Amino acid sequence: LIGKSINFLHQVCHDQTPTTKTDLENAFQGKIDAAYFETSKYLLDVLNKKYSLLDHMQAMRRYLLLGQGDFIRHLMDLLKPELVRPATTLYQHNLTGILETAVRATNAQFDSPEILRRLDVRLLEVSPGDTGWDVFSLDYHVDGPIATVFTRECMSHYLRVFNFLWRAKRMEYILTDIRKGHMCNAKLLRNMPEFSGVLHQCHILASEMVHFIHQMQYYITFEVLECSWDELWNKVQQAQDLDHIIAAHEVFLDTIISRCLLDSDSRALLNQLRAVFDQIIELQNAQDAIYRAALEELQRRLQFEEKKKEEENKRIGEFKESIPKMCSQLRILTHFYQGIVQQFLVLLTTSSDESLRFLSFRLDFNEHYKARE
Amino acid sequence: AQQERDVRELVRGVAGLQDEADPNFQLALNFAWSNFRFHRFLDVNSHKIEKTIEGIYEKFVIHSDLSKAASWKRLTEEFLNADAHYSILSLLLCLSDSPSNSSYVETP
Amino acid sequence: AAAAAANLNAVRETMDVLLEISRILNTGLDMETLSICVRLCEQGINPEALSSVIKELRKATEALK
């Protein structure tokens, strides 16, 4: 360990204090511990100041683990119209600059140029299919001496967790757009005696989606990036070997893989979770499928009033034809969603010892699924 | 000789034109052979095909589709052992690619 | 002989490998049509030339709907 540290200190760091300094009448226990002490302590200091290992970790949480939040929402907020259009006509040229507008607006602007330079865009593994929302990724390039603590195989983990927490933070914003559509539109649909039923049914169904996308998203907040961050911060702040940094870093990434649904055994649970990502984009379409007929007619009714300055009775009639099919469709969607989330919970109960077990109690307080078991 | 019957059968299968005495069959065939003889592409670059295959494997690994990644690596490595390989691969690649994220369902 | 009939078996096996490769890339091809494409690639042609035609006739089957 000592010879490796002093050889690494010459050949890589190239900052040198020249000649860094019963058994067999026992000089070993006197010489070796003092040498080990001095060598390792200098090595830790020069790596954390000349190449700054720690500042990279803080921007690995904010950027790669998406834990900053201000930058991440305002970026994706400005990034929505690009991603809604298909990805064959999207390039890095449009990525880096809207990133720059977001960066100058947000807290990132004050930070050091090294970590900011080391964040740059990448395209997610380009393959045909025109999946606009899927093509975006961050590539964090480490090419310093600190590459050994930030090796390329654990950056792949950063990419994977970034991908899952790209999907989820996309879906959450779709959901709050539904909720925004409720608070904007429905004060115009108080003048409708017949659409009140179906819009109210959507109000009730939406809050369960909101709840499911806010219980998971507090477990992911306060136990996946608040407890794990703390225990990692302890095990880096004390650590007195390069090995000690690395071997805590690895298992911190693995422990977060266990907390989320990305294990080889919890693929079955992840499928259940993806089935809730189906219904949200379904419901988003249905909500506007109301308004493109329902809101549309009232302006036409106003113009029919301007005509007078028997037709519209048929518009009432075709709506009284249209309402039951949409209502019953919504009913079956509601049933389907409740059943599949119950199936998620029943497999969820015995998967891991503690971590996944706690999620069951997060996602249900009411014990609705003891009365719908 | 065999190639001509092949282009006939490709028109029949892909276009759904099972009657050669349909004029649409002969028009699609003339279209097929004229496209074949209009040399406008560079020859297949085996290295670019290899890079694309590897990138598909990385996209599978990134999305934690472990069975599809292991399948993808396994099938590509077995197929590349006994030029025309890279040709067929590129062909499939540009052909649709459509739900490369979906359709995992690895039976074997 | 025998190894000349073991080779027809080992080509059908490699073809089944291609059948899984065909579906995980999500091509519209199956065992029947890809059997044609293989012999065509033996004769030598741009794959970009074959594919544009197949992209045309798969969308010119909706003129025969």
Structure description:
This is part of a larger assembly, with chains A (373 residues), B (108 residues) and C (65 residues). Chain A is mainly α and 373 residues long. Chain A has 13 helices and two strands; from the N terminus they run ααααααββααααααα. In chain A, α4 (70-84) packs antiparallel against α5. The longest helix of chain A has 42 residues, at 267-308. With 108 residues, chain B is an all-alpha fold. Chain B is elongated, with a radius of gyration of 18 Å. The relative contact order of chain B is 0.09. Chain C has 65 residues and is mainly alpha-helical. Chain C is 71% helix and 0% strand. Chain C has helices at residues 3-24, 31-43, 47-57.
Which key terms come to mind for this protein?
part of a larger assembly; 3 chains; A: mainly alpha; two-stranded antiparallel ribbon; 13 helices; 2 strands; elongated; C: 65 residues; mainly alpha; 3 helices; Gamma-tubulin complex component 5 (chain B); acetylation (chain C)
Q: Identify the strand order in the major beta sheet of chain A.
A: 1-2
What is the N-to-C succession of helices and strands of chain A?
A: HHHHHHEEHHHHHHH
State the share of residues found in helices of chain A, binned by percent.
Answer: 55-70%
Which structural class should the secondary elements of chain A be placed in?
Answer: mainly alpha
Major beta sheet summary of chain A? 2 strands, antiparallel
Instruction: Estimate the helix proportion of chain B, in percent.
Output: 55-70%
What's the assembly state of these chains?
part of a larger assembly
Strand content of the residues of chain A, in percent?
under 5%
Number of helices of chain A: 13
Report the C-alpha radius of gyration of chain A, rounded: 28 Å
Subcellular location (chain C): Cytoplasm, Cytoskeleton, Microtubule organizing center, Centrosome; Cytoplasm, Cytoskeleton, Spindle
Protein name (chain C): Mitotic-spindle organizing protein 1
Keywords (chain C): Acetylation, Cytoplasm, Cytoskeleton
Main location (chain C): cytoplasm
